[PDB]
Symmetry: C5
Subunit: 94 residues, 5 copies
């Protein structure tokens, strides 16, 4: 079960639950970005923690290994430069 | 069961030997054009898996699973070919 | 079961025990202001698990298993910038 | 079963086939005090695909995750600057 | 089951065999406020001596690893190059 969402800045994504109690993040990647600053991908659980940092041309992508419980209503957001981030992974149970 | 295809820029790849396919690397090959190039997956939308650019970053390892969901692979960006490599898998 | 802690410099953290094992998945800086900073675990001996700096490398993935019962310890050493540890919990 | 080979430039490696083991997994590639400063590719041969790109004092090592079928008598070679490459992995069944 | 060792430059390390577990997984190699400025390689022995990674003071101080070593093979780990210690960190695993 493939998972993918494009995380627009100032849009907070709570991942939709197809079927699967958990979600696994495998990749984060920018998309021909315009703003030239760093951007953080964050999960809100509480507390709000940085899972990765992208800064346009220097580092446009990074692998991930993040498990998120969907029943825990985990939240995903960007905070740095105003750029969209492409999340890619797969669904998983418990 | 080894998997490998060279993705020409103006070519969209649909990978079915096994049920799922695991991507292990995308890598350039003596590229000539200098801009960035993205590797993309289409499964209900079109998502970037990685970004490659001559000199800056010519390859990256991958850990992406795709259900053989009639997923599609394409490159976007520089007029450069990209070597996708991985392996097949059941369940 | 998601895990996350912000390890302030000169605060030594023993990870919270959600009802047994913990896997470290990421270490990452956060708009740092101040050189290198190391993330360390003190399992008897004290081992560097990763190295972060302001401009060269602000985050890195991790793949570390830690026993919570073994009272393993986490600390940063070097430049005084906060580090976001992120991972997930696991049993046995 | 540990696997290790030094892939000299312009010498084609077909990994020795252990009886019992059918597949071989590549886990890491790394340079060794290289002399020529150009880039070098590691390749596997249906077709001949670049599995990694290494370069002196720029990117000397990389992790790998390549499974190769031993019965298919697949081939490994480096193609670029005249530098040797250290492949490390393990033998495996199914 | 955590594993960690600091490989001094003059030392060949054979990882301790914790019974119950059979394999050992290397997760990281990382320097520790190094003093010498040359590059240093992390190597595994056996018949051969193979480089798993390369570390240097200012350019690249750590790298992730994903190396499986069978404890049955009593493999050896050493660094060769600049006189710097390298912190190997990982965990034990069964089968």
């Amino acid at each position: 079960a493939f998972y993918g969402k494009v995380v627009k800045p100032d849009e907070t994504v709570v991942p939709e639950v197809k079927d699967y109690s958990v979600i696994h993040l495998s990749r984060a990647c920018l998309n021909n970005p315009e703003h030239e600053g760093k951007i953080y991908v964050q999960v809100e659980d509480n507390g709000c923690y940085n899972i990765c940092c992208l800064q346009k041309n220097v580092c446009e992508d990074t692998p991930l290994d993040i498990f998120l419980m969907l029943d825990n209503d985990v939240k995903i957001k960007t905070s740095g430069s105003s750029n969209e981030v492409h999340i890619v992974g797969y669904y998983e149970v418990s």
